[PDB]
Amino acid sequence: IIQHSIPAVELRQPFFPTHMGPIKLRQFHRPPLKKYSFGALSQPGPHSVQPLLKHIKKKAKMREQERQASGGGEMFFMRTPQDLTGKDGDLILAEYSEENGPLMMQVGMATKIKNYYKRKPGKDPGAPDCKYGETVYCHTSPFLGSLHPGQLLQAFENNLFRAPIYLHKMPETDFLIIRTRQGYYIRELVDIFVVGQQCPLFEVPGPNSKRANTHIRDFLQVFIYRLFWKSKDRPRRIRMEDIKKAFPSHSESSIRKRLKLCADFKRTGMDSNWWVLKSDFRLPTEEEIRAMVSPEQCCAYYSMIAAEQRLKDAGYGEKSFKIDDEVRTAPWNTTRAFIAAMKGKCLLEVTGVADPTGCGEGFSYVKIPNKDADLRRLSLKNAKQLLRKFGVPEEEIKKLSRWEVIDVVRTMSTESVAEHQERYKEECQRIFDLQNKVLSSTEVL
Amino acid sequence: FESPRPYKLTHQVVCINNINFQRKSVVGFVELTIFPTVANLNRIKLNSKQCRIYRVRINDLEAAFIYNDPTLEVCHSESKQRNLNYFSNAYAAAVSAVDPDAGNGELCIKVPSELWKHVDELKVLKIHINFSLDQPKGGLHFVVPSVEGSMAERGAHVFSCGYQNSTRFWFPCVDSYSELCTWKLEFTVDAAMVAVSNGDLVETVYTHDMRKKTFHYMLTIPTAASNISLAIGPFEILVDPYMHEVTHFCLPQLLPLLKHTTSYLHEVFEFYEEILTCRYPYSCFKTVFIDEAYVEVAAYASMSIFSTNLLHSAMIIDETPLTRRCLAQSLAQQFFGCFISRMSWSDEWVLKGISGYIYGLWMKKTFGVNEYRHWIKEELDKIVAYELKTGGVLLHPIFGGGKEKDNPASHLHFSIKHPHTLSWEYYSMFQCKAHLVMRLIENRISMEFMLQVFNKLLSLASTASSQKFQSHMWSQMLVSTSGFLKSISNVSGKDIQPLIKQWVDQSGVVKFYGSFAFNRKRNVLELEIKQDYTSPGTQKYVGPLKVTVQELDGSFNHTLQIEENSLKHDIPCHSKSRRNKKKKIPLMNGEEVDMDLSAMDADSPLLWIRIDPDMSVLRKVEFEQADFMWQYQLRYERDVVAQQESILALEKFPTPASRLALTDILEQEQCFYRVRMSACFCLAKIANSMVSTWTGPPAMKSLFTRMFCCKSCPNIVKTNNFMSFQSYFLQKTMPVAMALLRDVHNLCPKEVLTFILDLIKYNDNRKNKFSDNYYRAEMIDALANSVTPAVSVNNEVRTLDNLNPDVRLILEEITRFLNMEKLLPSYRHTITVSCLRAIRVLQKNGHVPSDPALFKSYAEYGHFVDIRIAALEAVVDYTKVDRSYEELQWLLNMIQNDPVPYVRHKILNMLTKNPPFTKNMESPLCNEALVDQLWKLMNSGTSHDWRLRCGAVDLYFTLFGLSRPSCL
Amino acid sequence: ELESQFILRLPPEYASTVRRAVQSGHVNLKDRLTIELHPDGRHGIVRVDRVPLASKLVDLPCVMESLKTIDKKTFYKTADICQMLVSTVDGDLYPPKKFIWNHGITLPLKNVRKRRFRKTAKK
């Protein structure tokens, strides 16, 4: 059960952007350092970098006092945008080994660490303790490969993806700098995780699909409703200009579709007009708006339009998405391949072109399906001598039922659907164990 | 936030002395340690009734004394406004003035000017009150067997049952809830008779060394005054061995009955501390069984005292649910009378809500999850039945302050600020709506978050308790509705205030006219169903919800709802399931195996309609499907709710023989117990419609044939069919439904009558180790369900024919069982209860004449509770049908005069349920003097208990309710 | 607005001095450590105890996420980090493709651009 922060669940801006340009899609989850037009740090010259140690201890004390005053147990603290800052609380860094993951969390979303451990045979004293995460004892492996007895494997867990994580040490030269309009902030941090290839749990849509087009419509319907809740006029009213500024890629006619059922147009003698909320329309409450669009659905759409921009930059037009190799690496292709393979509908390519590492250290998420005369002329005696020659044990030579003998010698001269799935498991296990070895190694290259 | 009550309290010491068995009196002194709040607190008020004070004292200074009783009659005894409304309003205002939650008076000691200057100096005082209870007429009980020479010593006991605010009736206090105090309790008791109250055994040797003993129970744990009760007399048994500290107190010659009874309690403690993540937050736990019960449930601090009717001694199978059911009730309401506490009567509903939900969670992981859902169906049946009888049961945060009413729920009585106006129907539905509002909190908030909430509540309770009495920082154990709502919103803030304003603050039962339409019957539109509702009188408009549709072989389709309920809605459509001879099972629900093209399967991809199968909304859903869909629901469905609602819907109209076949197929599997009870009732109702349509055999003989093989059973099933309780409940139920099988010539159940006679012949010895009692009782009930009203054509009532022919055989068998249970008696004379119900049914059919003298002789004092309650139900229905005014006069005089409260309770309850003298149908002339005597019995002679005049308020609800009685 | 975060890399003696200053928690670190960015947005000067170190803003190849926690089990993502300001003891303090960093911060992610990144096939 994942409980996101309140600005994440409330679909708030700029945590959930409404529209992203071609520049923003290339810079998706890589925000460039941008100058301010006003404020303290819009000025030239050196700027003070302030410590946080008193602020961290004070906030941790206050949150503990709020826990003990009602009167203990588990308390939810991520209620405001101010609570989501990096200025307070215990922090990690997480470095994704994938350049562009199929699913990505936004600022404000939540994830868990589960410490997957397979018990040793006989008398297990228990899993080793870790600084982070909750221990989960598993008999069936949640990954593509199987855990070994006594093996502890840390992993990120949320509604988007599953991916193994590896605790490393932050280098002694590297610090975390928090930069705002008001000043520079610095905190010490030692714990950094290397995150492997994701096992996606939520489906990424294709471009201009019915699911994708429903998501854009619903997200527009969510954004319109919260504009009415922001309006202080009685009766409530909004402007077309505010929606078009947030949604420059929509035509006004598509916005006219979403506004006709809930609002009435009142024209005024100025090029700035209002949509007045219908008196007989009950505006939906906050948690009803929450059920319309989830944070996980936005990330699946965000992954699509960013990857669609990357394919257009690579020369692939919309008619390409019989299929090209790079189009197979798209997240709408990889996640549909993996989830169907997770549900037992098909198997995976694993050694193939959709390997994100490019050197054999990852998985390729591409669907593959789940798919005598002369021996009987041997005239028992020569078949007996042949079974003696191959090294067949003397019991089978001794019984010498001739049909059984010829079936055994055909089997030995052979030495198919149980081998097909076993070779899939062998290929999965090899790269899984190889990925465990490389990304956890402290070798200096 | 804080209580609007001055004069905070810390300590109190009771000392019962000279407890008498002949003049039956109690003397004692009480000790209060008081921190007053404000100056000029002169008229300090305590409250009690039936307590003659000997002296009051504060630090060797006897101050003034005020003793009023406005809980008695109107200040003018002949107030001619003898109606419901004026008496209800005046009684509500008067007993609110009895309550000290204002400047009021019942026991106002006046502080003298010397002690007023002391209060001006120091607001710390002690209160020493010497007083005496008389022969207790509503505050205690002295159960004494009528021997009085020697067995009054060994055989009698002394206790106090009562309602929540019955601590007033026992020893003088405040409004007895919501005063966090601590107690020292001194008990002058006999050496054999053991006193049982709250607290701990802090000082007990052979005390005072003269002739008797004296017990010191100290309650250091801060609770309220409405948890103290003193059972004196029973015998000590530790039934410890699993948890080492569970103590029990019961009357002699009942002790191995406890040795079987108590166990499985440790499992309930383990599950409750899996819930709460604590220990049992006390030293020990006490339980007393007693042959009387004001309330069967009653649960106090570290102590449960209730009836000696729930022993269930290892052979009496049909109290396998009931015993630990009532133990779970007396542990849950215990736990929420201990620490978590209301600030007012309107703020209570959280408490019994979470208690009933906790023993519902106990009913989850102990026995019968499908029986748990059947219990939820019984909860909805109770709520829909009562709030279609009367108005809603509303859970107020809003007062009527400023002499205001604000009560649409005042169809009878006041409800906001006060307990002792309500009825037990209203109180039971208060608890039932508390159950289902907690299920709505399940439906919007996860169970793990509820565990977090409840752990937070008990963390604040245990932290705020067991300390040095932190001044001004101690009322955190008042965890009423507002702060509890704030704690829920701090854990998970959702639209739970709309849930309050729907179900907590708008008391309405919602029917559902969800009209089935059929699209994709090769139609343009695709799988659409209309939503509709309007049914006034008691209605409620509930909007955004979801709807569950099961396909032929497919997905659970869930569909939203809207307000403005003249609606049309869609389904997230199934595929076109065509070539269904090839599409045999495309994953209906897992690996279930079912194949029927017997339905209207030309163009029908739908099977069943459902709105919230987890039973969120207080609902009464009315719709129509094809009959094949209803009958295909009864071959298999994963909801006992769906099975018994299809059972009701197919009890209404149909009679094909395929219905009988599918019913018999459903009755021969492993599905559920009571589904087959109501399915045999389906067979009864449908074979009653087989008068001209007798296609099948005489039913349910082949069901006993094909299901029960003792030694292959050569045409008769006889012996030793137990240790499989499926067959136990089924053989208990089925001949009752067999006796209903009637086709109209003379209704002629003659083969069934002779077969039931042969079954009554063929009973078992001790090879069955299971005390064959209830099987006999329900077969006698089947004899009672052999109603033959049309024998006496002209005058055949009065020993003409020695009335004939099978009624005499039924009289022979009920005579045999009455005299056997007079000689054998096996477990409570339950056979005698069924026989008296049979004798009343025979009096209702004119065979045995309508004479109450047998029922009069079984409504006498020295019998069991069940015999007396059955004879009193019988004489209430006798006064209903026949015009016996004299037995009604005797019934009202016994309402006035008897020591047992529960028989008065149930006389008033089922006299309201089964009324004679019906309003605006007045042929037996209530106006003569019965209105006067009922007005007297409301005013006088009813200061014993609150609930007896509550039942009399229910009587004037039924009898001439919102008007003059047409006297003058 | 979204909070901007980036990695600051120092020479090891200066990293140890600033690390002791951060662990000490004294306010005067706001004077002991300053950062100045040039108008080109790529070069800068990091001053440690008024000592200038020539700094270069480079783009990290791997997307990095910084996450906060209270109970060390459920984590809340705070920021995306993709840039690092690297301070050197030599180099032009006022300088008149080379800002592409090739390596991960962690040990196994060495040479990700050349060895562990599948390269896009054009056309």
PDB file of C-alpha atoms in Angstrom, chain A residues 23-102:
ATOM      1  CA  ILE A  23      12.941  21.025 -24.905  1.00  0.00           C
ATOM      2  CA  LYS A  24      11.251  19.848 -21.688  1.00  0.00           C
ATOM      3  CA  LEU A  25      10.724  16.319 -23.045  1.00  0.00           C
ATOM      4  CA  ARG A  26      14.428  16.040 -23.886  1.00  0.00           C
ATOM      5  CA  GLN A  27      15.179  17.452 -20.414  1.00  0.00           C
ATOM      6  CA  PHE A  28      12.625  15.138 -18.742  1.00  0.00           C
ATOM      7  CA  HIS A  29      13.962  14.312 -15.233  1.00  0.00           C
ATOM      8  CA  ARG A  30      17.181  16.199 -16.086  1.00  0.00           C
ATOM      9  CA  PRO A  31      16.374  19.823 -15.160  1.00  0.00           C
ATOM     10  CA  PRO A  32      19.093  22.257 -16.236  1.00  0.00           C
ATOM     11  CA  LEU A  33      20.375  24.874 -13.831  1.00  0.00           C
ATOM     12  CA  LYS A  34      18.518  28.054 -14.784  1.00  0.00           C
ATOM     13  CA  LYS A  35      19.117  31.662 -13.750  1.00  0.00           C
ATOM     14  CA  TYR A  36      16.505  33.579 -11.764  1.00  0.00           C
ATOM     15  CA  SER A  37      15.068  36.900 -12.931  1.00  0.00           C
ATOM     16  CA  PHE A  38      14.571  38.189  -9.368  1.00  0.00           C
ATOM     17  CA  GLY A  39      15.535  37.285  -5.823  1.00  0.00           C
ATOM     18  CA  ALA A  40      18.825  37.074  -3.952  1.00  0.00           C
ATOM     19  CA  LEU A  41      20.462  34.596  -6.361  1.00  0.00           C
ATOM     20  CA  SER A  42      19.516  36.641  -9.429  1.00  0.00           C
ATOM     21  CA  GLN A  43      22.384  39.004  -8.368  1.00  0.00           C
ATOM     22  CA  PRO A  44      26.013  38.448  -9.435  1.00  0.00           C
ATOM     23  CA  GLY A  45      28.861  37.576  -7.108  1.00  0.00           C
ATOM     24  CA  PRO A  46      29.344  34.943  -4.408  1.00  0.00           C
ATOM     25  CA  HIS A  47      26.398  33.747  -2.335  1.00  0.00           C
ATOM     26  CA  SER A  48      26.347  32.222   1.147  1.00  0.00           C
ATOM     27  CA  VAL A  49      25.964  28.445   1.506  1.00  0.00           C
ATOM     28  CA  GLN A  50      24.176  27.850   4.797  1.00  0.00           C
ATOM     29  CA  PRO A  51      24.252  24.855   7.185  1.00  0.00           C
ATOM     30  CA  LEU A  52      21.180  22.786   8.043  1.00  0.00           C
ATOM     31  CA  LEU A  53      22.180  20.860  11.202  1.00  0.00           C
ATOM     32  CA  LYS A  54      20.060  22.899  13.624  1.00  0.00           C
ATOM     33  CA  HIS A  55      17.103  22.815  11.211  1.00  0.00           C
ATOM     34  CA  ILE A  56      17.270  19.019  10.743  1.00  0.00           C
ATOM     35  CA  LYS A  57      17.316  18.317  14.493  1.00  0.00           C
ATOM     36  CA  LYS A  58      14.477  20.779  15.166  1.00  0.00           C
ATOM     37  CA  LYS A  59      12.188  19.306  12.491  1.00  0.00           C
ATOM     38  CA  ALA A  60      12.916  15.708  13.543  1.00  0.00           C
ATOM     39  CA  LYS A  61      12.173  16.684  17.156  1.00  0.00           C
ATOM     40  CA  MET A  62       8.879  18.408  16.255  1.00  0.00           C
ATOM     41  CA  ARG A  63       7.672  15.529  14.061  1.00  0.00           C
ATOM     42  CA  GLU A  64       8.515  13.110  16.881  1.00  0.00           C
ATOM     43  CA  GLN A  65       6.621  15.338  19.336  1.00  0.00           C
ATOM     44  CA  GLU A  66       3.624  15.394  16.983  1.00  0.00           C
ATOM     45  CA  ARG A  67       3.845  11.585  16.892  1.00  0.00           C
ATOM     46  CA  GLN A  68       3.932  11.247  20.683  1.00  0.00           C
ATOM     47  CA  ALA A  69       1.117  13.761  21.269  1.00  0.00           C
ATOM     48  CA  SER A  70      -1.477  11.662  19.422  1.00  0.00           C
ATOM     49  CA  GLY A  71       0.015   9.338  21.000  1.00  0.00           C
ATOM     50  CA  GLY A  72       2.435   7.131  19.128  1.00  0.00           C
ATOM     51  CA  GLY A  73       2.616   4.647  16.303  1.00  0.00           C
ATOM     52  CA  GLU A  74       2.662   5.538  12.609  1.00  0.00           C
ATOM     53  CA  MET A  75       2.040   9.121  11.508  1.00  0.00           C
ATOM     54  CA  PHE A  76       1.806  10.680   8.041  1.00  0.00           C
ATOM     55  CA  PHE A  77       3.861  13.858   7.686  1.00  0.00           C
ATOM     56  CA  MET A  78       3.876  14.682   3.947  1.00  0.00           C
ATOM     57  CA  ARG A  79       0.871  17.005   3.927  1.00  0.00           C
ATOM     58  CA  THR A  80       2.275  20.279   2.510  1.00  0.00           C
ATOM     59  CA  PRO A  81       4.718  21.213  -0.275  1.00  0.00           C
ATOM     60  CA  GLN A  82       7.012  22.545   2.473  1.00  0.00           C
ATOM     61  CA  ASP A  83       7.182  19.031   3.971  1.00  0.00           C
ATOM     62  CA  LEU A  84       8.582  17.642   0.687  1.00  0.00           C
ATOM     63  CA  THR A  85      11.767  19.729   0.849  1.00  0.00           C
ATOM     64  CA  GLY A  86      15.245  18.221   1.135  1.00  0.00           C
ATOM     65  CA  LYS A  87      16.148  20.612   3.962  1.00  0.00           C
ATOM     66  CA  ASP A  88      14.964  18.186   6.673  1.00  0.00           C
ATOM     67  CA  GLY A  89      14.663  14.490   7.468  1.00  0.00           C
ATOM     68  CA  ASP A  90      16.937  11.608   6.560  1.00  0.00           C
ATOM     69  CA  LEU A  91      17.835  11.457   2.855  1.00  0.00           C
ATOM     70  CA  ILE A  92      19.344   9.108   0.272  1.00  0.00           C
ATOM     71  CA  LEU A  93      20.551   9.508  -3.273  1.00  0.00           C
ATOM     72  CA  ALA A  94      19.382   7.016  -5.899  1.00  0.00           C
ATOM     73  CA  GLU A  95      21.318   6.763  -9.166  1.00  0.00           C
ATOM     74  CA  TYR A  96      19.422   4.955 -11.920  1.00  0.00           C
ATOM     75  CA  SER A  97      21.629   2.756 -14.111  1.00  0.00           C
ATOM     76  CA  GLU A  98      19.056   3.153 -16.895  1.00  0.00           C
ATOM     77  CA  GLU A  99      19.472   6.312 -18.965  1.00  0.00           C
ATOM     78  CA  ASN A 100      15.699   6.594 -19.624  1.00  0.00           C
ATOM     79  CA  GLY A 101      13.613   4.225 -17.511  1.00  0.00           C
ATOM     80  CA  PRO A 102      10.209   2.965 -18.659  1.00  0.00           C
TER      81      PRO A 102
END
